[PDB]
């Protein structure tokens, strides 16, 4: 668990950095908006899941 | 300390508090990019 | 020649330079000479 946790958290951090750049750029980008809206929904659902994963896994490494 | 499992993230935690200041500075970068119009 | 490297980038990069060098000087207030330690 002490790696499946540390990856889940490193995954949450990396995705967060990608969303931090990607979401504003997408929202203010003229074209390519249909492929953006899909990815933003995907990014979002994945970020939420990873938070729940890191949160649950917290209790197996603390 | 943070609980030991989170220790590798210490250095990141050290910097996060400054991020709000970077938002104020970002407002100026943005405005320079549109010529302070 | 010209206006190749936009002024907003020059400003942002040079401003970040200033912050780094001044930040370094603040670091030095707490380490080595002048630190009281």
């Amino acid at each position: 668990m002490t790696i499946l946790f540390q990856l889940a958290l490193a995954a949450l951090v990396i995705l967060s950095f990608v969303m931090v750049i990607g979401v504003p750029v997408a929202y203010a980008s003229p074209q390519d908006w249909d492929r953006s809206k899909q990815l933003i929904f995907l990014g979002s659902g994945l970020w939420i899941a990873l938070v729940l994963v890191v949160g649950v896994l917290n209790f197996f490494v603390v | 300390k943070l609980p030991e499992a989170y220790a590798i993230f210490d250095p990141l935690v050290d910097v996060l508090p400054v991020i709000p200041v970077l938002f104020l500075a970002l407002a100026f970068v943005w405005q320079a990019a549109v010529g302070f119009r | 020649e010209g206006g190749r490297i936009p002024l907003w980038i020059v400003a942002t990069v040079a401003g970040m330079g200033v912050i780094v060098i001044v930040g370094l000087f603040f670091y030095g207030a707490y380490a080595g000479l002048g630190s009281s330690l």
Partner: peptide, 29 residues
Amino acid sequence: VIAQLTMIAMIGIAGPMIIFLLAVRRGNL
């Protein structure tokens, strides 16, 4: 420490990168 400076460099580039990307792509700045 290299780790703190590296985090602060990456976090500090993110903001201007958003602006640079949008300006390149003639976005809604």
